[PDB]
């Protein structure tokens, strides 16, 4: 029971599964699409100090990954290189075949130390961390991601109508992922 949204010509309706409207025509698997949309488009604060408050560490919950085929250009990506004060890794290494988000103008690369009191870093609002055509619930080490969400669509019968430089900004952080976190931007 996941909302499948059907796009009629010049309209979008959330397909009601109990009712059956056959007037929509789905003649091939080419018409089924998944799309990733960035939270930026809803007006959420993108500043690094504000953004970092939405993530938090948690143990006991296994990570999960789901693929998506098409995405949106991001203005802001993030890249974490975090270590514990003794010197250890609190973010897991990227599994095979997880590359960074393809297109983002600014990459906020944050390095520093924190308590990292948990096995994995999750999103407190239930959104996903979007990578290159894979959305995962957790943050991986050294791999640029965007915050986003996934939707599923039935495209219209007509194919045709529907479906570069980057900069890096470096930050130092102490007490990362805490109530009060201290940043110095270079």
């Amino acid at each position: 029971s996941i909302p499948l949204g059907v796009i009629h010509n010049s309209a979008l309706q959330v397909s009601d599964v109990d009712k059956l409207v056959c007037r929509d025509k789905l003649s091939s698997t080419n018409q089924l699409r998944s799309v990733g949309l960035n939270l930026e488009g809803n007006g959420v604060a993108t500043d690094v100090p504000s953004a970092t408050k939405r993530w938090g560490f948690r143990s006991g919950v296994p990570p999960k990954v789901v693929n998506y085929e098409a995405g949106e250009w991001a203005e802001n990506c993030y890249n974490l290189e975090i270590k514990k004060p003794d010197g250890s890794e609190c973010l897991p290494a990227a599994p095979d075949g997880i590359r960074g988000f393809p297109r983002c103008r600014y990459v906020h690369k944050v390095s520093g130390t924190g308590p990292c009191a948990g096995d994995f870093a999750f999103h407190k609002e239930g959104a996903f961390f979007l990578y290159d055509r894979l959305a995962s619930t957790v943050i991986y080490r050294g791999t640029t991601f965007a915050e986003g969400v996934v939707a599923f669509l039935i495209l219209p019968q007509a194919k045709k109508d529907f479906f570069y430089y980057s900069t890096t900004i470096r930050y130092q952080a102490t007490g990362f992922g805490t109530n009060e976190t201290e940043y110095l931007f270079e």
Partner: antibody, heavy 122, light 110 residues
Amino acid sequence: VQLVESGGGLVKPGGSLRLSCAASGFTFRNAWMNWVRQAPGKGLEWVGRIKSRADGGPTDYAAPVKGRFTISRDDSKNTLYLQMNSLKSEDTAVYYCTTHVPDYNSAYYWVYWGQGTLVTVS
Amino acid sequence: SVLTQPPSVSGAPGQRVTISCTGSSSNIGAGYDVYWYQQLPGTAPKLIIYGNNNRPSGVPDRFSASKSGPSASLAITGLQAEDEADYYCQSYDIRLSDNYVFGTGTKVTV
């Protein structure tokens, strides 16, 4: 894992000195280190921290001792050098170099202190 | 800017005693591990307790520990004569850019 510190001698206040911590038993390239000193009749105390060279983070110093002391390392010799300049009053204590190194299982990082040296001013 | 601890504790042989280390929001409150070291007079401190009751090597199961809120405790059951030592609690402060803070010191007596 073993550490040995040397350089312990009496110095007239106002001079300079070099304390050397030489270790063996672990990959010395990728470990953080801290210099900690213990005064007689008092609890332990912290003086400085040096980060790994690969990370490149700036070394940090305590609040009273920031400035005069200078920490560094040398990988080709596997050593950690602490240089103290213009020694004043009450800088009199044992010095230990502490590192955190895993056990090849990486599940945790034990602490491995050193024997330390004596440094007195007069 | 130092961790607190009781001046000294006492107890009969074979019973249990607990040593308290009370921190602040920046250290233990934030979520950092607590390290316990035992210094016998004349030598250097070694590690006794790390994190959640983890023993490095050759440590009697008599030593345990807990953490709650901004405080922590070390529990030792079955005090013997050789337990005379100074115990120090350590953590990482934040207002110090994530760096050592040490406890005062406790005289455990048997």
